[PDB]
Amino acid sequence: PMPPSEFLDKLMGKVSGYDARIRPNFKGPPVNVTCNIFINSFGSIAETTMDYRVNIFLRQQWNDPRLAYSEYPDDSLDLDPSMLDSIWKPDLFFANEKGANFHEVTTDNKLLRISKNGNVLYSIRITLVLACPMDLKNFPMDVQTCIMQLESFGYTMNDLIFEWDEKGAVQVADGLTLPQFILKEEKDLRYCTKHYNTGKFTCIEARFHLERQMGYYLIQMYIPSLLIVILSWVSFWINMDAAPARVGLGITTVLTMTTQSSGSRASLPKVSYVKAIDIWMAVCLLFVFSALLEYAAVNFIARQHKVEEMRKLFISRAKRIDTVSRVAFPLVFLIFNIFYWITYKIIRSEDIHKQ
Amino acid sequence: PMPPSEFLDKLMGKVSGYDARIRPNFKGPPVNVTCNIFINSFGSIAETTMDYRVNIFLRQQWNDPRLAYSEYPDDSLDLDPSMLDSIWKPDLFFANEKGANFHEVTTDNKLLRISKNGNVLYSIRITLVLACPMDLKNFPMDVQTCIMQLESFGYTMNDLIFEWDEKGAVQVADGLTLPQFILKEEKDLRYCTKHYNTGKFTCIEARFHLERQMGYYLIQMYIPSLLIVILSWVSFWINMDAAPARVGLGITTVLTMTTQSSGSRASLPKVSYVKAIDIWMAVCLLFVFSALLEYAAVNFIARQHKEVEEMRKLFISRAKRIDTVSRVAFPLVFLIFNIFYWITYKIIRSEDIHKQ
Amino acid sequence: PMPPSEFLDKLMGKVSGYDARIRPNFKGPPVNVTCNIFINSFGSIAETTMDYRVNIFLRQQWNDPRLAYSEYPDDSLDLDPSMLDSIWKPDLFFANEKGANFHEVTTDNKLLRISKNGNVLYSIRITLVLACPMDLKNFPMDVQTCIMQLESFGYTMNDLIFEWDEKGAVQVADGLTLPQFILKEEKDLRYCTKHYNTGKFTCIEARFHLERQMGYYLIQMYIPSLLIVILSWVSFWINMDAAPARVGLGITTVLTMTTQSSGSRASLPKVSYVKAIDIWMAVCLLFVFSALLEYAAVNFIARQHKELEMRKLFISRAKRIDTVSRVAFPLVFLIFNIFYWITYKIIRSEDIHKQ
Amino acid sequence: PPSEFLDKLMGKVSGYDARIRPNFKGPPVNVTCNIFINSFGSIAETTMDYRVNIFLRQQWNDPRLAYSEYPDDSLDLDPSMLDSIWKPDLFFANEKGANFHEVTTDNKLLRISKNGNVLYSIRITLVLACPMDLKNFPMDVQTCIMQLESFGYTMNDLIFEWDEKGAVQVADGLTLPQFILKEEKDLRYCTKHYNTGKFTCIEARFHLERQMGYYLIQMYIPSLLIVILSWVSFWINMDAAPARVGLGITTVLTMTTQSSGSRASLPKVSYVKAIDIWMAVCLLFVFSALLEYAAVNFIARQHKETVEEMRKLFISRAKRIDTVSRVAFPLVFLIFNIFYWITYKIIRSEDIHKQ
Amino acid sequence: PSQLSSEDLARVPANSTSNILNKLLITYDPRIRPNFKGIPVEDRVNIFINSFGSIQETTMDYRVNIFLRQRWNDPRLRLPQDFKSDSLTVDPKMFKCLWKPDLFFANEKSANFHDVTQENILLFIFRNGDVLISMRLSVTLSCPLDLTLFPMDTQRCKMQLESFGYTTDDLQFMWQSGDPVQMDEIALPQFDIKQEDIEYGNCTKYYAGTGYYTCVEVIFTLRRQVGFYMMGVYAPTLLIVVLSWLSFWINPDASAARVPLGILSVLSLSSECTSLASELPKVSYVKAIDIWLIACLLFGFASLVEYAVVQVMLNSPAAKRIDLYARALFPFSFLFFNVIYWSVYL
Ligand SMILES: CC[C@H](C)[C@H]1O[C@]2(CC[C@@H]1C)C[C@@H]1C[C@@H](C/C=C(\C)[C@@H](O[C@H]3C[C@H](OC)[C@@H](O[C@H]4C[C@H](OC)[C@@H](O)[C@H](C)O4)[C@H](C)O3)[C@@H](C)/C=C/C=C3\CO[C@@H]4[C@H](O)C(C)=C[C@@H](C(=O)O1)[C@]34O)O2
Ligand SMILES: CC[C@H](C)[C@H]1O[C@]2(CC[C@@H]1C)C[C@@H]1C[C@@H](C/C=C(\C)[C@@H](O[C@H]3C[C@H](OC)[C@@H](O[C@H]4C[C@H](OC)[C@@H](O)[C@H](C)O4)[C@H](C)O3)[C@@H](C)/C=C/C=C3\CO[C@@H]4[C@H](O)C(C)=C[C@@H](C(=O)O1)[C@]34O)O2
Ligand SMILES: CC[C@H](C)[C@H]1O[C@]2(CC[C@@H]1C)C[C@@H]1C[C@@H](C/C=C(\C)[C@@H](O[C@H]3C[C@H](OC)[C@@H](O[C@H]4C[C@H](OC)[C@@H](O)[C@H](C)O4)[C@H](C)O3)[C@@H](C)/C=C/C=C3\CO[C@@H]4[C@H](O)C(C)=C[C@@H](C(=O)O1)[C@]34O)O2
Ligand SMILES: CC[C@H](C)[C@H]1O[C@]2(CC[C@@H]1C)C[C@@H]1C[C@@H](C/C=C(\C)[C@@H](O[C@H]3C[C@H](OC)[C@@H](O[C@H]4C[C@H](OC)[C@@H](O)[C@H](C)O4)[C@H](C)O3)[C@@H](C)/C=C/C=C3\CO[C@@H]4[C@H](O)C(C)=C[C@@H](C(=O)O1)[C@]34O)O2
Ligand SMILES: *[C@@H]1O[C@H](CO)[C@@H](O)[C@H](O)[C@H]1NC(C)=O
């Protein structure tokens, strides 16, 4: 009955005497803010810069006593986004954020709702670039923990306290599929209170567990690496007295393999610890490099002969090495392959336990 | 006993007569401002553009006699961040800044606290793309000093003087482990007053020492170079008359070193002095190149006999002795080079460590 | 004893009657503006886009009769930077400017000082990416002139005239060192008045002479090119009948030299003239191609004996070709090296005379 | 006095409504447009766009803004006053990202004549979209398009006209690095029809010609060297299978990299370009070089299979193929070259007629 | 301007927006929606495609420039028969003082308005009260891509228009009855865009604790042009296979000749595969182009393994049968693969 416009002015207005500068319940118990997050999109995870981008809906709930209304029967009246300036809002901000911006497509992407008891609901559409320190050992098979830190710049824990919502704290949009990662459904909600010389400030943290899909890594690096090792083994069936042919084969494989190893570092950041792709690349280089010395020994042993019995002995030894190599080289690679994967599988299992 | 709104108007309000345009203690002693630095995030050091990025909290403290209150018994008051626009705030700009922005993720990221005596505590979240000159004389095993300069643009030292807080000037976060650098605990705090035609202006400087981590360069640069040098020595066991194989081996090793050296310079700026990595690559390139010359000599000596039998045997024996000595000398001389190269750079670094 | 707040309204106030819209000395002689720049940082020179970035302090001085004060006995009164909004300021802008911005790191980086006579000092901190056309006839060892043009958009020569300051028009920061260029200590200050359809406008220009450093280019392109040439020469000592070795040696050097030339153009614009580096890369390619070309003549001459004592003469001719080549190719290269450097040095002196 | 007049012309007393167009409920207002091109560059094939820095001038008679009391005509106003006057809503329909400069002040001009004519000049930087026809890619002419349309006012309110004299003006000494800007510019009327109605639009076309210096030195000459290198094989010994086959394969592989490199810059188009014809024929010639030795090796070995007289015939057959090829391959390349360069010059002549 | 009925309004002009618009907006509150506490508003939406392009595969997005049209009946904004014209074409600056729906693109990555010389907005007010607001927007939408069948694939890219603050009880979005998406005569470099667009609609979103929200979606069908990859990928790989067959004519005893021919052919194809991966995102599934590259590598690999068998047979103490058969079958087997491959992918 009473006009809608008057209610906007009569409440939280100059006549009302509401002061947006003064927090609710001044000189009293700390304000308690419950927070929700809805993840619209997750992606753009970059190892080089150690950051990821996310688009979220940040919802906050708090109780302002000065905003209670009994004149209108309806509850949870939606307000206008343009009048949010005069509403008192908590100074939440992201500790690990590197770049954030609001969204203004047609109007401001903001929602404000006020219930009769004074409860306030305020949701914003934000895009976050968040810093994520990464441990890049076990690089191909690595679970990565991403964190989001929400803490208060200006209000101490005597005035503003942040808590996670009981039901549906972090909610993920339906059918959200990361390109090269898998996001686990278990989310860790922790308290990490911050202490500064200025004082103590409230902080809440949400942790995401990301598993790396290994389809791409097998096709583009592991399988090509297998070819270079196998192609090197072709030399063991080439004639013994084919020094241009066999050495040329050896050099091309070894040098191509080094370029393939150099290809991997392009995207990775410059780190000073050994990774799992290094242990693969190092052993692969050892196998091709040992093939070159295999022919070098055969060539040297053959010429060592310079009565007739001596050349029979030396020539047999060079031939024997090639026949032994034809089985020894594939066999040792098989032993290494079995040990490599099982060792790295049990580690990955423990990674799930560590989450 | 006083409503909060009324106190906000009675002090620093229009009725109060506080003009933020005039500095405290006008026509009097210079305003003294204390400064603090909390390093929230350090990283993105880029050699090519010779800059680094940093996320910090900047706290300034200055005594304003006008902003004094006796109505409220509390020692301090956490005022609203939005009302800073009517506060007199000292001008502070960074002399070596190439880019900066404020943070407006949800609200204004600033803190204002006013004490009873009139002290003001004013804290800001800033992201700075600062520029640091880098020596690069010894690209591996170097220590770099970054600079942060805090100075005033409009107020001279007769009016505004900037100092460093006595306790805890620079405060690093709990972790903040840089991927490529190690940040030393000791930080130098110095005064570097600036003089211009406009006048004399105050300035304070904080220097950070960063030591480059050697793990990445050993695995991805030195070890690949070592492999090619060893690969070259394989030519001293192949047949003496196998011209396509040995020449093919020699050329492929030398050319690979050139591409490896070319790869290294890409990430570096176009400086015009010789770096430590250059000396390594040059000597390694010298070794592999000398291997090719070794085959050239033995090839010429071997066929020299045709150009009776006694001369032929002597030349072939002369040719073979080159191979025997080469397969021993070339590893050994490289070994001797490695001892000299590493030992000198360590003593050089250790003396520089004292300087840094 | 005048209050500071009250005095600041007696000038630049509603009571004052000062209109910032109307220029000083309306309907009268032109306003004389003296300008200074302080070079705080120089760098980011980019050949590909033909621009450079500079951070400067721009100071301006003009006499405003209205801003005359007598109550305060101070020779000058430094004023708050915020006051700049209420004072007439000339509309200076840069004609070669691609992008420029102000700095608001903590406060506006501006300085205003007013003297008793009415002089005004107005210093601004600006960072500008300036366009510089470049002449790359000699890609190294050239002198590039970078200009800065300061002109007025809306005020004609009848109202606003710009002048350089008699002393210290351009001042450079202490210890400024460009990484790949050397900045000369002599800067030419000239006048270039502009005429458009809308009238005549004042403009002042300051040009900087930058000299490229040769230290980088010598150890990264000239020495590598010299290595490829000297590598080709060893073929003259390789056995005459070893066709796979020498032919493989000849082709590999020529192809690698081609790649080295391609590497040089990565950082250069797609210019249609001939650069100095092109002459070096062409001559180096000419030498290595000739070495391969020589072997084809030796092979053709050598096989003639079997197809056709005639045997001895054909074999003798082939050996003499190799023997002369071992001294001809080094010597002819040496003559080229002497000619190439000395001719361009006198060209460098001529360009130094032209600044 | 100056200050009082500005209020009188457009102020609270004046009642000048900036929201009503001139000659309301009457004939459309006439708009005369000028363009001065201060900078032309950043022509990128990949994104099919170019960047321009221009001064945009508009003239429209406003009857309300007529002054008789000041004797002087065309008195220049302050740039800040532009908020008060009614200004047409020009925009560039084919544009991508626009920005004002505000380097030290707003780069704007305002002039008002006694009769009421208004002149409003602004400095703009524009990234405009240019569709490109990449057929005849090294020898092509590209027409750039600049469209000025009115977004809010239909043909009853706002009509656009080009200035009779000096519509598009180019700054003195403007030299595009990669293109030659012709001095003839086409101005047409292209009215746009939408579901809202008819809106005025004017278009100015720039005719650009690509400089051929860069592509000759960097693409055609390197390609013509690999072809010649292939011909060296025709002099190497027939029995030298490792040499000629090695030489053959290296040239073919090197040509393949060059062809891919040539297309790296320009976009992924689905039509055949001029550069593709050249690279294809070059690939055909080097491939035919590899395919001629294979026929000579096979024809020779057939002697082993009058056994001696069988041997002679086969050996002669092999030599004849090599001798004929030595003159045949250069001759066919020459005939292709003259055909290739004549037809494209003819097509280029037709293209300039279209321009 | 015009806020709180333009303050005193002492000025007295004659029958202009100084009078009509101010009288129209004397009691107008933009904060209160039309038909407050009643029927939800029905907002007709149209799109005009100025420029479609920049379909980036690395970031799986595309950038479009469009004009957004909206229509809604405003009971308060009724022309009081003062003007016999059915339109007002008021100044574009007035958009700030009137109610506007809070439309936002849910799948959008970055958006910007455009300020060439003025705000690029059109406002129309019909006599009945209907409002037509037009706006120039440049939006970077996000498109998930399925890169199986990669060289010859079809991709559906959507555009979702939904409200942020008003639920389905207050604000409802629907597509215009006739010609909702008026495209322009445009051409794409690497893709082909059809004129048949699926106006799916619905898309109504439910968010826990806030309620239902209206949405409308337009799906664009894009077909890739296969011409570029013919010259770019298929033809180079087909060439390298042909060189591999050349070894079968080279002398059986030419170890230093055939072996480089085999190894350099295999390694050349492998490098070509790596270059293709650079443009494509790091997907974990196989693509159509891969089955081509695997077979080409298999044929290249089988050439070198063929010579190794010949070298064993010659030194085993004939081997000409192995070479002679290889010359016929190796081209022949490749022909069958091509027939099956292209037929399967049409
Ligand atoms: C020993 C070198 C000769 C030339 C041998 O090289 C090869 C072939 C045969 C030659 C005889 C190939 C070579 C590896 C070696 C075998 C080496 C290993 C299997 C490991 O290495 C050891 C040595 C290393 O000490 C430098 C030692 O210190 C550590 C200490 C710390 O850990 C406790 C660690 O924090 C610190 C950073 O480092 C550590 C025990 O790891 C394995 C990790 C090797 C990795 C090397 C490479 C992977 O990709 C690189 C590059 O992109 C490429 C092109 C070539 C690779 C290569 O060249 O790999 C490469 O450089 O064999
Ligand atoms: C001639 C080609 C045969 C294959 C010869 O090539 C080689 C070796 C032996 C073969 C017989 C190598 C070749 C150069 C030639 C020798 C050529 C020169 C020493 C110069 O060139 C002449 C020819 C040129 O005409 C196109 C001629 O016109 C001018 C006219 C105008 O000025 C008046 C000018 O505005 C216009 C644009 O051009 C002009 C007199 O300059 C010298 C400048 C050569 C430059 C070429 C190259 C440098 O880097 C390029 C590329 O990055 C690379 C990978 C290979 C180089 C190469 O391939 O260099 C390269 O392409 O010898
Ligand atoms: C057929 C290949 C065999 C193996 C022959 O290949 C070679 C050497 C000898 C082998 C017997 C080399 C090969 C070309 C052929 C000769 C071919 C031509 C002179 C033309 O080509 C044909 C093929 C083309 O589509 C492959 C075909 O369809 C058109 C249809 C439509 O137009 C009507 C068009 O909309 C659509 C896009 O394309 C059309 C009939 O024109 C000429 C235009 C060739 C261009 C090919 C290339 C140029 O740069 C490419 C690449 O960067 C590189 C590394 C290799 C080149 C190559 O590999 O070139 C390359 O791929 O000879
Ligand atoms: C077997 C490889 C040898 C070296 C053969 O390589 C070649 C030729 C002949 C050699 C004998 C060439 C090679 C492909 C293979 C044929 C391989 C396939 C048709 C597929 O592969 C299989 C094997 C794979 O297990 C290694 C197997 O996954 C396991 C583990 C899984 O657990 C997570 C489990 O889910 C599953 C059940 O089982 C799985 C069935 O996929 C196919 C997916 C491979 C494509 C590879 C390539 C295409 O572009 C790549 C690269 O850019 C390039 C440079 C070279 C290519 C290449 O190298 O192509 C390349 O790497 O033949
Ligand atoms: C508006 O009013 C004026 C006089 O006040 C009148 O002349 C004019 O015709 C009116 N316009 C209409 C009725 O459309």
For residue B125, CA distances in Å to A101, B40, B128, C154, E80 come to 16, 9, 10, 39, 55
Q: Which residues pair with C2 in a beta bridge?
A: none
Q: Are strands D75-76 and D49-61 parallel, antiparallel or unpaired?
A: unpaired
- B 317-356: CB under 8 A from C: none
Beta strand spans in chain D (E) = 29-44, 49-61, 75-76, 90-92, 95-99, 108-112, 117-129, 141-150, 158-162, 168-170, 179-189, 192-193, 198-199, 201-210
Q: Is the dihedral of CA B299, B305, B311, B313 positive or negative?
A: positive
Q: Are strands A188-191 and A203-212 parallel, antiparallel or unpaired?
A: antiparallel
Q: Are residues C219 and C206 in the same domain?
A: no
Asked if residue E273 has its Cβ within 6 Å of ligand 4, the reply is: yes
Q: Report d(CA D32, CA D159) in Å as an integer.
A: 9
Query: Burial level of B116, CB count in 10 A (0-12/13-18/19+)?
Result: middle
Nearest Cα of chain C lies from the Cα of B185 at a distance, in angstroms, of 27
Element (H, E) at D249: helix D241-262
Element (H, E) at B78: strand B76-79
Residue B99 falls within a domain, yes or no? yes
Q: How far is the CA of E82 from the centre of ligand 5 (A)?
A: 8
Return the ligand 1 atom nearest residue A265 CA. Answer: 52
Q: Report d(CA A56, CA A290) in Å as an integer.
A: 54
Instruction: Note the Cα A58 to chain centre separation in Å.
Output: 21
From E11, E12, E15, E86, mutation site for ligand 5 pocket: most ligand atoms within 8 A of C-beta: E15
**CB-based contact A243 B244, cutoff 8 Å:** yes
For residue C254, CA distances in Å to A4, B232, D249 come to 85, 22, 15
Q: DSSP character for B159? A: T
Q: Report d(CA D286, CA D230) in Å as an integer.
A: 6
Q: Are residues C209 and C219 in the same domain?
A: no
Residue A352 falls within a domain, yes or no? no
Q: How far is the CA of A289 from the centre of ligand 4 (A)?
A: 24
Q: Report d(CA A145, CA A95) in Å as an integer.
A: 16
**CB-based contact D194 E182, cutoff 8 Å:** yes
Return the ligand 3 atom nearest residue D259 CA. Answer: 52
Proximal ligand: closest to the CA of A273: 1
Q: Are residues C180 and C206 in the same domain?
A: yes
Q: Report d(CA A65, CA C274) in Å as an integer.
A: 79
Q: Tell me how far apart the 2 most distant CA atoms of chain C are, in Å.
A: 122
In this complex, the residue of C131, C271, C278 whose CB is nearest that of residue D39 is C131
Q: Are residues C203 and C234 in the same domain?
A: no
Residue E306 in tokens: 């063929």
Residue B322 in tokens: 């080159």
Nearest Cα of chain D lies from the Cα of C98 at a distance, in angstroms, of 9
Chains near C (3 or more Cβ pairs under 8 Å): B, D
Return the ligand 2 atom nearest residue D224 CA. Answer: 4
Nearest CA among C296, C220, C286 for reference residue C253: C286
Q: Report d(CA E121, CA E97) in Å as an integer.
A: 14
Q: Report d(CA B202, CA D27) in Å as an integer.
A: 64
What is the span of the domain harbouring residue A228?
Answer: 214-347
Domain final residue pick, A187, A213, A239:
A213
Residue B305 falls within a domain, yes or no? yes
Nearest CA among B161, B137, B132, B133 for reference residue B25: B161
**Rg, Å, chain D Cα set:** 33
How many domains in chain D?
2
Nearest CA among A309, A4, A344, A349 for reference residue A140: A344
**CB atoms inside a 10 Å sphere around CB A260:** 20
Q: Are strands B93-94 and B143-151 parallel, antiparallel or unpaired?
A: antiparallel
Nearest CA among B276, B258, B20 for reference residue B139: B276
Nearest CA among C144, D121, E55, C104 for reference residue B100: C104
Rounded to 10 degrees, what is the CA torsion of A104, A106, A108, A113? Answer: -150
Q: Are residues B85 and B305 in contact, defined by beta-carbon separation less than 8 angstroms?
A: no
Instruction: Note the Cα D98 to chain centre separation in Å.
Output: 19
Q: Report d(CA C57, CA C59) in Å as an integer.
A: 6
Q: DSSP character for A160? A: E
Give the list of residues 6+ apart from residue C82 with CB closer than 8 angstroms, or none: B21, C108
Residue A228 falls within a domain, yes or no? yes
User: Which of A159, A197, A252 to substitute to test the interface with B, most B CBs within 10 Å?
Assistant: A197
Q: Is E2 left (phi over 0), alpha (psi -120 to 50) or beta?
A: left
Element (H, E) at D340: helix D307-354
Residue carrying structure tokens 């900087």:
C208
**CB-based contact A234 E60, cutoff 8 Å:** no
3-state secondary structure of A198: coil
Residue nearest to atom 44 of ligand 2 (CA): C282
Model resolution, angstroms: 3.0
Q: Are residues C115 and C76 in contact, defined by beta-carbon separation less than 8 angstroms?
A: yes
For residue E75, CA distances in Å to E24, E33, E79, E99, E175 come to 11, 10, 10, 12, 21
Is C233 in CB contact (< 8 Å) with chain D? no
Q: Which residues pair with A43 in a beta bridge?
A: A53
Q: Report d(CA D155, CA D135) in Å as an integer.
A: 38
- E 278-337: CB under 8 A from D: none
**CB-based contact B299 C239, cutoff 8 Å:** yes
Residue E67 in tokens: 């004009």
Chain pair D-E, CB pairs under 8 angstroms:
148
Residue E290 in tokens: 């891969």
Q: Are residues D181 and D34 in the same domain?
A: yes
Q: How far is the CA of A178 from the centre of ligand 3 (A)?
A: 38
Q: Report d(CA E227, CA E224) in Å as an integer.
A: 9
User: Which of E7, E54, E91 to substitute to test the interface with D, most D CBs within 10 Å?
Assistant: E91
Chains near E (3 or more Cβ pairs under 8 Å): A, D
Q: Are residues C167 and C36 in contact, defined by beta-carbon separation less than 8 angstroms?
A: no
User: Which of B103, B197, B292 to substitute to test the interface with C, most C CBs within 10 Å?
Assistant: B197
Nearest CA among D113, D30, D24, D27 for reference residue D66: D113
Q: Report d(CA D182, CA D162) in Å as an integer.
A: 20
Q: DSSP character for D7? A: H
Counting every residue written for chain A, the total comes to: 355
Q: Are residues C131 and C42 in the same domain?
A: yes
Asked if residue E294 has its Cβ within 6 Å of ligand 4, the reply is: yes
Q: Are residues B79 and B220 in the same domain?
A: no
Asked if residue D256 has its Cβ within 6 Å of ligand 3, the reply is: yes
Task: Provide, for chain D, the percentages of residues in helix, strand and coil under a 3-state DSSP scheme, each rounded to the nearest 5.
Answer: 35, 30, 35
Q: Are residues D146 and D94 in contact, defined by beta-carbon separation less than 8 angstroms?
A: yes
Residue D352 falls within a domain, yes or no? no
Q: Report d(CA A57, CA B109) in Å as an integer.
A: 20
Residue D217 falls within a domain, yes or no? yes
**Rg, Å, chain A Cα set:** 33
Q: DSSP character for D78? A: P
Residue nearest to atom 24 of ligand 3 (CA): E231
Q: Are residues D183 and D216 in the same domain?
A: no
Residues of E in contact with D64 (CB under 8 A): none
Q: How far is the CA of D228 from the centre of ligand 2 (A)?
A: 14
Q: Are residues A260 and A225 in contact, defined by beta-carbon separation less than 8 angstroms?
A: yes
Q: Report d(CA C16, CA E216) in Å as an integer.
A: 59
Asked if residue B220 has its Cβ within 6 Å of ligand 1, the reply is: yes
Is B266 in CB contact (< 8 Å) with chain A? no
In this complex, the residue of B19, B198, B254 whose CB is nearest that of residue C123 is B198
Q: Are residues C134 and C122 in the same domain?
A: yes
Q: Is residue D26 a known part of a binding site?
A: no
Domain final residue pick, D154, D177, D211:
D211
Is A83 in CB contact (< 8 Å) with chain E? yes
Q: Is residue C188 a known part of a binding site?
A: yes
Q: After which residues is chain D broken (C to N over 2.5 A)?
A: 305
Q: Are residues B151 and B163 in contact, defined by beta-carbon separation less than 8 angstroms?
A: no
Give the list of residues 6+ apart from residue A272 with CB closer than 8 angstroms, or none: B179, B180, B213, B214, B215, B216
Show the 3-state SS of chain C: CCCHHHHHHHCCCCCCCCCCCCCCCCCCCCEEEEEEEEEEEEEEEECCCCEEEEEEEEEEEEECCCCCCCCCCCCEEEECHHHHHHCCCCCEEECCEEEEEECCCCCCCEEEEEECCCEEEEEEEEEEEEECCCCCCCCCCCEEEEEEEEEECCCCCCCEEEEECCCCCEEECCCCCCCCEEECCCCEEEECCEEECCEEECEEEEEEEEEECCHHHHHHHHHHHHHHHHHHHHHHCCCCCCHHHHHHHHHHHHHHHHHHHHHHHHHCCCCCCCCHHHHHHHHHHHHHHHHHHHHHHHHHHHHHHHHCCHHHHHHHHHHHHHHHHHHHHHHHHHHHHHHHHHHHHHHHHHHHHCC
- E 103-122: CB under 8 A from D: 112, 114-122
* Amino acid letter, residue B180: Q
Residue B200 in tokens: 């004399």
C-alpha angle with apex A132: A126 to A133, nearest 5 degrees? 165
Q: Are residues E192 and E55 in contact, defined by beta-carbon separation less than 8 angstroms?
A: no
Residue B356 falls within a domain, yes or no? no
Q: Are residues C221 and C134 in the same domain?
A: no
**CB-based contact B113 A273, cutoff 8 Å:** no
Q: Report d(CA C292, CA C288) in Å as an integer.
A: 7
Element (H, E) at A246: helix A243-264
Residues of E in contact with D90 (CB under 8 A): 116-118
In this complex, the residue of C40, C248, C263 whose CB is nearest that of residue B248 is C248
Residue A41 falls within a domain, yes or no? yes
C-alpha angle with apex C272: C271 to C277, nearest 5 degrees? 70
Instruction: Note the Cα A2 to chain centre separation in Å.
Output: 54
Q: Are residues B153 and C111 in contact, defined by beta-carbon separation less than 8 angstroms?
A: yes
Q: Are residues B158 and B227 in the same domain?
A: no
Residue C90 in tokens: 């000339």
3-state secondary structure of E341: helix
Q: Which residues pair with D180 in a beta bridge?
A: D209
Chain D: residue nearest E113 by CA? D97
Q: DSSP character for E198? A: B
Q: How far is the CA of B19 from the centre of ligand 2 (A)?
A: 73
**CB-based contact E118 D196, cutoff 8 Å:** no
Element (H, E) at B195: strand B194-195
Nearest Cα of chain D lies from the Cα of E211 at a distance, in angstroms, of 35
Q: Are residues C140 and C214 in contact, defined by beta-carbon separation less than 8 angstroms?
A: yes
Domain final residue pick, A213, A228, A251:
A213
Q: Are residues A83 and A98 in contact, defined by beta-carbon separation less than 8 angstroms?
A: no
Q: DSSP character for E119? A: B
Q: How far is the CA of A290 from the centre of ligand 3 (A)?
A: 42
Half-sphere exposure at residue E337, Cβ-oriented, CA atoms within 13 angstroms: 15
Q: Are residues D162 and D291 in the same domain?
A: no
Q: Tell me how far apart the 2 most distant CA atoms of chain E are, in Å.
A: 118
Query: Burial level of A281, CB count in 10 A (0-12/13-18/19+)?
Result: buried
Q: Report d(CA B235, CA A243) in Å as an integer.
A: 11
Solved how?
A: cryo-EM
Asked if residue E271 has its Cβ within 6 Å of ligand 4, the reply is: no
Nearest CA among B177, B221, B173 for reference residue B56: B173
Angle between helices E255-279 and D241-262 (to 10 degrees): 10
For residue B144, CA distances in Å to A296, B138, B181, B356, D226 come to 47, 11, 9, 8, 48
Nearest Cα of chain B lies from the Cα of A68 at a distance, in angstroms, of 20
- A 81-140: CB under 8 A from B: 89-98, 100, 102, 124, 126, 128, 131, 133
Q: Is the dihedral of CA B276, B282, B287, B288 positive or negative?
A: positive
Return the ligand 5 atom nearest residue E83 CA. Answer: 14
Q: Is A349 left (phi over 0), alpha (psi -120 to 50) or beta?
A: alpha
Nearest Cα of chain B lies from the Cα of C55 at a distance, in angstroms, of 9
Q: Is the dihedral of CA B145, B146, B152, B154 positive or negative?
A: positive
Q: How far is the CA of A257 from the centre of ligand 1 (A)?
A: 14
Residue nearest to atom 5 of ligand 3 (CA): E239
**CB atoms inside a 10 Å sphere around CB B332:** 9
Rounded to 10 degrees, what is the CA torsion of D244, D247, D252, D255? Answer: -150
Q: Are residues D350 and D136 in contact, defined by beta-carbon separation less than 8 angstroms?
A: no
Query: Burial level of C133, CB count in 10 A (0-12/13-18/19+)?
Result: middle
